[PDB]
Design a protein around this ligand. Structure first.
Ligand SMILES: CCn1cnc2c(Nc3cccc(Cl)c3)nc(N[C@@H]3CCCC[C@@H]3N)nc21
Length: 278
């Protein structure tokens, strides 16, 4: 830690406190995360290299405490969404952000790395219009907002697939468009029933095997499904189609990141500049 200076606290991440730090030998400004089997597997994440993934620079194990050194970005998507809530993020920028996030997820999924806990606070942005995913692979290597959790997680499935990340990103997409969280649960059951009240209570027809899930209860409220045009207005039918595919209940059938990239919603994608106030 004497290898850094002006070490300054940004705030709480998922696994510990994130600091902004300046490296001694290089003058590099980095993000240093102090975390409250895992060493080798986190170390392997130093090999991931993609424009839409926050680079993991170094892993430091000292005094039985783990420090992860990452590339530094200046803002998260939560802050940007809050700053933009008056006016809304323009559609072309939502589109660009979604496209980029999908490309990051396509890459990680193709290397068998899941996120498992995507949320606007782990999506980081810069002045050039890039958005990047922070924390891939940490949940598996290591072994609180529920708002983005997939229904198979809430129903107690033990085996996690890449579909959980698509669900979370769909929730984020909806939130960028409406300005409000899609399923802001206050408890695990409230999270599940908010999903249920919007998308309808799942059944064997739309989700084979759901009623044998660990936490499934045959006494679960039987709500009808609502229309997407009620859920994410005034999003156009391309965007509503893609979101419907990202929020399919059956994880085997939820759209993949690769397939989502091909959706007609992205035919006119561009890369706008955000106006960031730093
Ligand atoms: C470890 C990867 N990593 C790289 N750059 C960051 C980073 N930059 C940042 C700097 C100023 C304001 C904001 Cl909003 C974010 N912030 C976080 N995490 C924060 C945890 C506290 C709340 C804000 C952020 N979510 N991690 C970063």
């Amino acid at each position: 830690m004497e290898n850094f200076q002006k070490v300054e606290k940004i705030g709480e991440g998922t696994y510990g406190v994130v600091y902004k730090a300046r490296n001694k030998l290089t003058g590099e400004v980095v993000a240093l995360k102090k975390i409250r089997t895992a060493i080798r597997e986190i170390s392997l994440l130093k090999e991931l290299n993609h424009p839409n993934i926050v680079k993991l620079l170094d892993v430091i194990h000292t005094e039985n405490k783990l420090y992860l050194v990452f590339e530094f970005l200046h803002q998260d998507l939560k802050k940007f969404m809050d700053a933009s809530a008056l006016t809304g993020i323009p559609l072309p920028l939502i589109k660009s952000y979604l496209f980029q996030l999908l490309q990051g997820l396509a890459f990680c999924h193709s290397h068998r790395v899941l996120h498992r806990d995507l949320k606007p606070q782990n999506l980081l942005i810069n002045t050039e219009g890039a958005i990047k995913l922070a924390d891939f692979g940490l949940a598996r290597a290591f072994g609180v907002t529920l708002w983005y959790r997939a229904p198979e997680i809430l129903l107690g499935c033990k085996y996690y697939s890449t579909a959980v990340d698509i669900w979370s990103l769909g929730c984020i997409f909806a939130e960028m468009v409406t300005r409000r969280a899609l399923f802001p649960g206050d408890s695990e059951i409230d999270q599940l029933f908010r999903i249920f009240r919007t998308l309808g209570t799942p059944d064997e027809v739309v989700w084979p095997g759901v009623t044998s899930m660990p936490d499934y209860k045959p006494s679960f409220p039987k709500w009808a499904r609502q229309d997407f045009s009620k859920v994410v207005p005034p999003l156009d039918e391309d965007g509503r189609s893609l979101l419907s595919q990202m929020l399919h209940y059956d994880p085997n059938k939820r759209i993949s990141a690769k397939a989502a990239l091909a959706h007609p919603f992205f035919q006119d994608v561009t890369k706008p500049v955000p106006h960031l106030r730093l």
